[PDB]
């Protein structure tokens, strides 16, 4: 007899960078999606393979809350069957993804005058990321055949780059805090329902 | 494993680095412009230096990727702009010499003033001082005094610095494998890598010379009319068959003839179109003006202003507490930031200037999807020209009767058409002979065809023959006339003002013919027509990522720069001028001077 703690997932003061994206398991509770759907504070709210009305009465045994922060125009790259830097090199959903996508405007908080360099992203990687794979490696990317030996230089780049956030950007760039919810079913009983 | 991968990997790393550091220097410059303090100067200097060293540092790695092995065109276009090392190729000893001379002549232009022999203790600057005297005074001596005293005092200082200015810029081109430094400015229109669209650096000279030949019939009559009007007001000081005196051209250098519209107005009893007294009774402010301007771009389908636009922009004089430059500029800071800095007053000119400054924003928002190195005008002449075509439709009587400014019952007839065109004829056509003359002058000096002692001799031979203007007083080798001009001492290539004139009417005839307009061209309005707005939007979003000759083919259906729209635009005026000039002598001889009696 407990509510699923979405309060600490959404209203947490500081999220992880997109490569550092934090996974939090949600189980053995009851989740109310009505206040989420009726808040109207969310810029982009979608669901895939499930209707937002139908999931009100329904039971899924495992709910994973993914959290990260990306660019406003890069929100379109979070979806099944998508490419681009955020999709390939950072956070990759499989084509069969059954969950939902949530985003809202963080510009009133996460951004400050002068830019905030804590938020980072992985610009280069040797290959694409498999579904739901966190890669935190700081290893120097290698573009050419010249051995890097872990130092900056010609054709050896530090892959982690920062998003500068000032308050003064246009609506397109502004930072959004995106929360991706995954839903699966396995042999375990489903404790999460309406 | 190829250079192409190493090239895309490098530039992708370069894109997100150029986005962050450029926005710092651009925001700092915004702080300097809006708020002028000693503290805000160091903030722009430190931010401007990091961006200067960044492009200087990235140019070291850029030359390591040979363009010979690069098959993809878009990567080759990006590196070609980055790989040029500019002034860094020169030796370090002359490096300090160049920037100092650039800043030295700049301060001479800014701090330059004129002083009368009568009371030496009092003196006046150029701005406002001489620009007020040259425009507002009808006196022969007063205009002549301002004309000579500025070139005599300032010209003596800049000439010995300008000669060394020529020597340094020449060796920079030969180290870049250019025939001269004049070839460096003409290299902006160079096109390579596309079969059949290649536009050679030497093709520009042959084209501009051919385009100006067909403008001469229009200009010789336009010059014959201005000479006829000023002759009646100055019978003794102006010869009927001779060239116009320099100081009587309406301003210092004869660039804009708009100041002469007062005496040259075709019809004095017919009311001129003025939206000023209409805006006062409605009590509009800077807020509604751009709303009417933004509503214009909504009618053509172009996107509207961002929410951060109205918040971050300073649209008015920020009080008497802090001083700010009121020169209208369109600031593109990158990363979706678009700002217009203007001191807004209620006037007919500001409403027409409003659509111009907003034109760049609609232009920069189109190619903003391109990477930073590809974020620029398709050429150096489109970026400014796109803002002018929007101002054209805004000045037409039809667009003014729609938005409520001009009365719906306003009468239109033959005498109204000529009045509105001749005002546009003085500004648009009057600046072409001055612009072609200036560019052909710099090009022959940098090439070396003109010895240093023939500069003042070759200058006023182009004044008389091309522009039909003669010097009121002879200048010896000591004076340097061009150096006193803004764009000459400030090291800005001035050919931009010739091309935007030809490229604005091509767009004008192209978009209006797409809107199925009927009748004369000058009465065209692109409002409510999406056919033109979508056709124009095809080119605007391309940026410099495509050859301008290719991008121009979409809009105007023509691969070559042509003046046919320009004569078609003034064709109503061109027929009327020859009728008033049939009793006057058309043409001018270069052997006449006011000081030879
Ligand atoms: C976060 O806080 C807001 C207001 O404080 C509240 O409306 C919202 O429900 C909170 N988030 C969750 C998941 O409850
Ligand atoms: C302008 O700069 C001065 C210097 O710090 C500062 O005191 C003032 O508040 C600034 N004004 C505005 C409007 O930012
Ligand atoms: C060149 O590379 C860009 C991306 O780096 C690509 O979009 C473009 O299609 C390439 N050029 C050609 C001709 O394929
Ligand atoms: C621009 O147009 C869009 C179209 O829906 C509108 O939502 C937006 O509010 C407009 N911009 C402003 C500042 O009103
Ligand atoms: C565009 O259409 C609107 C709607 O009828 C009209 O009010 C407006 O006057 C039109 N524009 C022009 C320039 O006539
Ligand atoms: Zn402009």
Residue B1 near chain A (CB below 8 Å): yes
∠ CA A92-A93-A94 to the nearest 5 degrees? 120
Virtual CA dihedral for B233, B234, B238, B241, nearest 10 degrees? 40
Q: Is residue B200 part of a domain?
A: no
DSSP lists the bridge partners of residue A45 as A102
| B207: in domain | no
Spatial separation of the C-alpha atoms in residues B408 and B426, rounded to whole Å: 28
Phi, psi of B406 (to 5 degrees): -90, 145
Which stretch of DSSP H or E encloses residue B33?
helix B3-34
Q: What is the DSSP string of A110-146?
A: T--TT---S-EEE---SSPPPTT------PPEE-SSS
CA B403 – ligand 5 centroid, Å: 8
State the Cα–Cα distance between residues B479 and B500, nearest whole angstrom: 31
| 3-state class percentages of chain A: helix first, strand second, coil last, to nearest 5 | 15, 25, 60
**Cα(A90)–Cα(A87) distance, rounded to whole angstroms?**
6
Select from B348, B349, B309 the least CA-distant residue to B328.
B349
Q: Which residues contact residue A46 at a Cβ distance below 8 angstroms, ignoring those fewer than 6 apart?
A: A79, A100, A101
Looking at the 3D structure of chain B, how many domains does it have? 2
Please give the backbone phi and psi of residue A177, each rounded to the nearest 5 degrees, phi first.
-95, 110
| Torsion (CA) B100, B329, B353, B569 in degrees, nearest 10 | 60
Pairing relationship of beta strands B469-470 and B244-245 according to DSSP bridges: parallel
SS3 content of chain B, % helix, strand, coil (to 5): 60, 5, 35
- Please compute, for residue A182, the number of CA atoms within 13 A of its CA located in the half-sphere on the CB side: 20
* Ligand 2 neighbourhood includes B37 CB (under 6 angstroms): yes
For ligand 3, the distance from its centroid to the CA atom of residue B74, given in whole angstroms, is 6
Q: How far is A157 from chain B (nearest CA, A)?
A: 8
Was B463 annotated as part of a binding site?
Answer: yes
Q: How was this structure determined?
A: cryo-EM
Length of chain B, in residues: 597
Q: Is the CB of B305 under 6 A from ligand 4?
A: yes
Contact B336 A157 (CB under 8 A): no
Q: Which two tokens stand for residue B473?
A: 């007083």
Atom 10 (ligand 3): residue with closest C-alpha? B72
Tokens in use for B67? 């363009």
Q: Is B566 among the domain residues?
A: yes
Instruction: Name the burial class of residue B1, with classes exposed (0-12), middle (13-18) and buried (19+) by CB atoms within 10 angstroms of its CB.
Output: exposed
C-alpha to C-alpha distance for B424 and B431, rounded to whole angstroms: 11
Residue from B337, B373, B327 nearest B127 by CA: B327
> Does B27 contact chain A (CB < 8 Å)?
yes
Determine whether the shortest distance from the Cβ of B307 to ligand 4 is under 6 A: yes
Tell me the three state secondary structure of residue B290.
Answer: helix
> In degrees, to the nearest 5, what angle opens at C-alpha B554 toward C-alphas B552 and B556?
65
Cβ contacts of B312 on chain A, cutoff 8 Å: 168
Which residue is associated with the tokens 């995954």? A182
Own/partner contacts of B172-179, CB < 8 Å, gap of 24 or more, are B172/B86, B172/B87, B172/B89, B172/B90, B173/B446, B175/B89, B175/B90, B176/B84, B176/B89, B179/B447
Nearest CB among B16, B27, B308 relative to A161 is that of B16
Using an 8 Å CB-CB cutoff, list chain B residues near A144: 6
Residues 6+ apart with CB under 8 A from B35: B318, B322, B324
Closest CA to B52 of B76, B94, B86, B78: B86
Tell me how far apart the alpha carbons of residues B451 and B458 are, in angstroms, rounded to a whole number: 10
B217, B221, B222, B227 alpha-carbon torsion, rounded to 10°: 140
Is residue B69 within 8 Å of B1, Cβ to Cβ?
Answer: no
User: DSSP string covering B358-411, please?
Assistant: HHHHHHHHHHTTS-GGG-S-SSTTHHHHHHHHHHHHHHSHHHHHHTTSS-TT--
Burial of B373 (0-12, 13-18, 19+ CB in 10 A): buried
Residue B333 lies in a domain: yes
Check residue A49 and give left, alpha or beta (phi > 0: left; psi -120 to 50: alpha). left
CA distance A127 to A142: 12
Q: Rounded distance, CA A146 to CA A103, Å?
A: 41
**CA B593 to CA B473: how far, in whole Å?**
9
B557's torsion region: left (phi>0), alpha (psi -120 to 50) or beta? Answer: left
How far apart CA B485 and CA B158 sit, in angstroms, is 11
Q: Are the C-beta atoms of B342 and B315 separated by less than 8 Å? A: yes
Q: Ligand 2: does its nearest atom lie under 6 Å from the Cβ of B35?
A: yes
CA angle B550, B178, B94 (to 5 degrees): 130
> Whole-angstrom Cα distance, residue A85 to residue B11?
15
Q: Which of B10, B13, B307 is closest, CB to CB, to A171?
A: B307
Q: How many other β-carbons are positioned within 10 Å of the β-carbon of residue B7?
A: 22
Q: CB–CB of B9 and A124 under 8 A? A: yes
Other CB atoms within 10 Å distance of the CB of residue B371 = 17
Q: Which helix (H) or strand (E) is B424 found in, with range?
A: helix B414-424
Class of residue B463 by CB neighbours under 10 A (exposed 0-12, middle 13-18, buried 19+): buried
Q: What is the CA radius of gyration of chain A?
A: 18
Residues B556-587 as b or e (16 or more Cβ within 10 Å = b)? beeeebbbebbebbbebbbebbbeebeeeeee
Distance of CA B63 to the CA centre of its chain: 33
Show the CA angle centred on residue B150, arms to residues B229 and B462, nearest 5°. 60
Q: Is B503 annotated as a binding residue?
A: no
Residues A116 and A175 sit within 8 Å (Cβ to Cβ): no
Residues 6 or more apart from A175 whose CB is under 8 A from it? A69, A70, A71, A72, A106, A107, A110, A111, A119, A163, A165
How close, in Å, is residue A167 to chain B by CA atoms?
A: 9
Smallest CA–CA separation between A68 and chain B, in Å? 20
Torsion of CA B73, B78, B79, B84, to 10 degrees: 130
Query: Among B67, B84, B101, where does a domain finish?
Result: B84
For residues B86 and B172, what is the distance between their CA atoms, to the nearest angstrom?
Answer: 8
Facing residues of A157 across strands? A141
| Ligand 5 within 6 A of CB of B527 | yes
Taking CA–CA distances from B308, the nearest residue in chain A reads: A170
Distance from residue A69's CA to the centre of ligand 4 (Å): 25
Q: Which residue of B has its CA nearest to A157?
A: B13
Among residues B478, B481, B497, B504, the alpha carbon closest in space to that of B561 is found at B504
- Residue B593 CA to residue B464 CA, distance in Å, equals 9
Q: Do residues A3 and A30 make contact, with C-beta atoms less than 8 angstroms apart?
A: yes
Radius of gyration of chain B (CA): 25
How many CA atoms lie within 13 Å of A74's alpha carbon, on the beta-carbon side? 22
Whether chain A has a CB inside 8 Å of the CB on B372: the answer is no
Residue A33, ligand 1, Cβ within 6 A:
no
Q: What is the DSSP string of A53-104?
A: TGGGS---SEEEEEEEEEEGGGGGG-SSS--SHHHHHT----TT--SEEEEE
Output DSSP code: residue B453: G
Helix (H) or strand (E) holding B551: helix B548-556
Structure tokens at B568: 């078609």
Number of other residues whose CB lies within 10 A of the CB of residue B505: 25
Domain limit, last residue, from B84, B104, B135: B84
- Residues just before a chain gap in chain B (C–N exceeding 2.5 Å) are none
Peptide bond between residue B128 and the one before it cis (omega within 30 degrees of 0): yes
DSSP state of B470: E
B69–chain A Cβ distance below 8 A for any pair: no
Nearest 5°: CA angle at A22, between A16 and A25?
150
Q: What sign does the dihedral B408-B414-B417-B423 (CA atoms) show?
A: negative
Q: What is the CB neighbour count within 10 angstroms for residue B146?
A: 22
Structure-block tokens of residue B98: 């160049």
The packing angle between helices B431-447 and B203-233, to 10°, is: 130
- Taking the centre of ligand 2 as the mean of its atom positions, its distance from the CA of residue B44, in whole angstroms, is 15
What is the chain A residue with the closest CA to B312? A168
Whether B211 and B98 have beta carbons less than 8 Å apart is answered as no
Q: Tell me which of B84, B119, B148 is where a domain ends.
A: B84
Cα of first residue to Cα of last residue in chain A, in angstroms, is: 12
Resolution in A: 3.9
**What crossing angle do the helices spanning B140-175 and B431-447 adopt, rounded to 10°?**
40
d(CA B409, CA B200): 53
> Can you tell me the distance from the alpha carbon of A16 to that of A88, in angstroms, rounded to the nearest whole number?
18
Dihedral sign (CA A35, A41, A42, A43): positive
CB pairs under 8 A between A and B: 51
In 3D, which of B146, B203, B78, B137 has the Cα closest to residue B549? Answer: B203
Positions of B marked catalytic:
357, 487
Q: How far is the CA of A162 from the centre of ligand 3 (A)?
A: 26
User: Is B500 annotated to bind ligand?
Assistant: no
Q: What Cα–Cα distance (Å) separates residue B547 from each residue in B80, B200, B501? A: 13, 12, 20
B511, B556 Cβ separation under 8 angstroms: no
Decide the pairing of beta strands A120-122 and A156-157: unpaired
Q: Which ligand sits closest to the CA of B31?
A: 2
For residue A11, the ligand 1 atom closest to its alpha carbon is 1
Distance between CA atoms of residues B410 and B272, nearest Å: 11
SS3 A20: helix
Please check whether residue B218 is in contact with residue B569, taking contact to mean a CB–CB distance below 8 angstroms.
no
Q: Where are the alpha helices (DSSP H) in B63-114?
A: 73-83, 92-111
Residue B385 in any domain: the answer is: yes
Answer yes or no: do A168 and B9 touch at CB < 8 A: no
Distance B307 CA to ligand 4 centre (A): 8
Nearest residue of A to residue B310 by CA position? A170
**Residue B267 CB contacts under 8 Å (≥ 6 apart), including other chains:** B415, B418, B419
d(CA B288, CA B435): 36
Domain ranges for chain A, please list them. Answer: 1-114+167-194, 115-166
Using CA atoms, how far apart are residues B28 and B50, in angstroms rounded to an integer? 12
Helix axes B564-580, B203-233, angle to 10 degrees: 20
B497 marked among binding-site residues = yes
Cβ partners under 8 Å of residue B159, min gap 6:
B478, B479, B480, B483
Range of the domain at B379: 276-429+496-580
* Torsional sign, CA B579, B581, B584, B587: negative
> For strand B113-115 and strand B123-125, is the pairing parallel, antiparallel, or unpaired?
antiparallel
**Residue in B closest to A85 by C-alpha:** B12
Angle at B568 between CA B393 and CA B402, to 5 degrees: 20
For chain B, the first-to-last Cα distance in angstroms comes to 79
* d(C-alpha A21, C-alpha B285), whole Å: 48
């Amino acid at each position: 007899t407990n509510l699923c703690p979405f309060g600490e997932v959404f209203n947490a003061t500081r999220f992880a960078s997109v490569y550092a994206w934090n996974r939090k398991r949600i189980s053995n509770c009851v989740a109310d999606y009505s206040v989420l759907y009726n808040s109207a504070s969310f810029s982009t709210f979608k669901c895939y393979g499930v209707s937002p009305t139908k999931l009100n009465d329904l039971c899924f045994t495992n709910v994973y809350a993914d959290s990260f922060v990306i660019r406003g125009d890069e929100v379109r790259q979070i979806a099944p069957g998508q490419t681009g830097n955020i999709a390939d090199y950072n956070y990759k959903l499989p084509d069969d993804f059954t969950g939902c996508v949530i985003a809202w405007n963080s510009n009133n908080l996460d951004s400050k005058v002068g830019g905030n360099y804590n938020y980072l992203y992985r610009l280069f990687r040797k290959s694409n990321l498999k579904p739901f794979e966190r890669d935190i490696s700081t290893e120097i990317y290698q573009a050419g055949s010249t051995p890097c030996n872990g130092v900056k230089g010609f054709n050896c780049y530090f892959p982690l780059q920062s998003y500068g956030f000032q308050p003064t950007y246009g609506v397109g760039y502004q930072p959004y805090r995106v929360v991706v919810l995954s839903f699966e079913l396995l042999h375990a009983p489903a404790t999460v329902c309406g | 494993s190829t250079i192409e991968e190493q090239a895309k990997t490098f530039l992708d790393k370069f894109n997100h680095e150029a986005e962050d550091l450029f926005y710092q220097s651009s925001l700092a410059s915004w702080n300097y412009n809006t708020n002028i303090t000693e503290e805000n100067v160091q903030n722009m200097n430190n931010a401007g230096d990091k961006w200067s060293a960044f492009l200087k540092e990235q140019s070291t790695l850029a030359q390591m990727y040979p363009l010979q092995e690069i098959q993809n065109l878009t990567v080759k276009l990006q590196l070609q702009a980055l790989q040029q090392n500019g002034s860094s190729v020169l030796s370090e000893d002359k490096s300090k010499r160049l920037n100092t001379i650039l800043n030295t002549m700049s301060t001479i232009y800014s701090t330059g003033k004129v002083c009368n022999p009568d009371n030496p203790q009092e003196c006046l600057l150029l701005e406002p001082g001489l620009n007020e005297i040259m425009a507002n005074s009808l006196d022969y001596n007063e205009r002549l005094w301002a004309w000579e005293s500025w070139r005599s005092e300032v010209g003596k200082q800049l000439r010995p610095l300008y000669e060394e200015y020529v020597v340094l810029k020449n060796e920079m081109a030969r180290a870049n494998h250019y025939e001269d430094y004049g070839d460096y400015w003409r290299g902006d229109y160079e096109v390579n890598g596309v079969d059949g669209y290649d536009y050679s650096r030497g093709q520009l000279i042959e084209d501009v010379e051919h385009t100006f030949e067909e403008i001469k019939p229009l200009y010789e009559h336009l010059h014959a009319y201005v000479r006829a009007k000023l002759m009646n007001a100055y019978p003794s000081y102006i010869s009927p068959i001779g060239c116009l005196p320099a100081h009587l051209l309406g301003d210092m250098w004869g660039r804009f003839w708009t100041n002469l519209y007062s005496l040259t107005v075709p019809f004095g009893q017919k009311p001129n179109i003025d939206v000023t007294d209409a805006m006062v009774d409605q009590a509009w402010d800077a807020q509604r003006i751009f709303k009417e301007a933004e509503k214009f771009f909504v009618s053509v389908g172009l996107p509207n202003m961002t929410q951060g636009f109205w918040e971050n922009s300073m649209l008015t004089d920020p009080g008497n507490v802090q001083k700010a430059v009121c020169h209208p500029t369109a600031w593109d800071l990158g990363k979706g930031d678009f700002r217009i800095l203007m001191c807004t007053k209620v006037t007919m000119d500001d409403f027409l200037t409003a659509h111009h400054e907003m034109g760049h924003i609609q232009y920069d928002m189109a190619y903003a999807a391109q990477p930073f190195l590809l974020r620029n005008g398709a050429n150096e002449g489109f970026h400014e020209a796109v803002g002018e075509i929007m101002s054209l439709s805004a000045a037409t009587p039809k667009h003014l009767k729609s938005i409520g400014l001009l009365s719906p019952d306003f009468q239109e007839d033959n005498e109204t058409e000529i009045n509105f065109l001749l005002k546009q004829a003085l500004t648009i056509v009057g600046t072409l002979p001055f612009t072609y003359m200036l560019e052909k002058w710099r090009w022959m000096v940098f090439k070396g065809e003109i010895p240093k002692d023939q500069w003042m001799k070759k200058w006023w031979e182009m004044k008389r023959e091309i522009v039909g203007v003669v010097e009121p007083v002879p200048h010896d080798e000591t004076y340097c006339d061009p150096a006193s001009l803004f764009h000459v001492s400030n090291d800005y290539s001035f050919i931009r003002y010739y091309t935007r004139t030809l490229y604005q009417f091509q767009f004008q005839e192209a978009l209006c013919q797409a809107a199925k307009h009927e009748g004369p061209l000058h009465k065209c309005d692109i409002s409510n027509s999406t056919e033109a707005g979508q056709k124009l939007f095809n080119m605007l979003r391309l940026g410099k990522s495509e050859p301008w000759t290719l991008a121009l083919e979409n809009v105007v259906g023509a691969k070559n720069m042509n003046v046919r729209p320009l004569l078609n635009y003034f064709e109503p005026l061109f027929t009327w001028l020859k009728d008033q000039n049939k009793n006057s002598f058309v043409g001018w001889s270069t052997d006449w001077s006011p000081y030879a009696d």
